[PDB]
Amino acid sequence: VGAXAXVXWXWXWXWX
Amino acid sequence: VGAXAXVXWXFXWXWX
Ligand code: NA
Numbered sequence: 001v002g003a004x005a006x007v008x009w010x011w012x013w014x015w016x
Numbered sequence: 017v018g019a020x021a022x023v024x025w026x027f028x029w030x031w032x
Contacts, residue, residue: 005026007031008028008031009022009023010021012025012026012027013024015022
């Protein structure tokens with residue numbers, strides 16, 4: 001849990 | 017739904 005890649009908040013593919 | 021900022025897959029903060 002923290003910063004980098006995976007899932008959650010920020011840039012890439014999903015919803016916003 | 018798609019690419020850009022928000023929740024889902026990618027970079028930033030959350031789970032690896
Ligand atoms: Na995200």
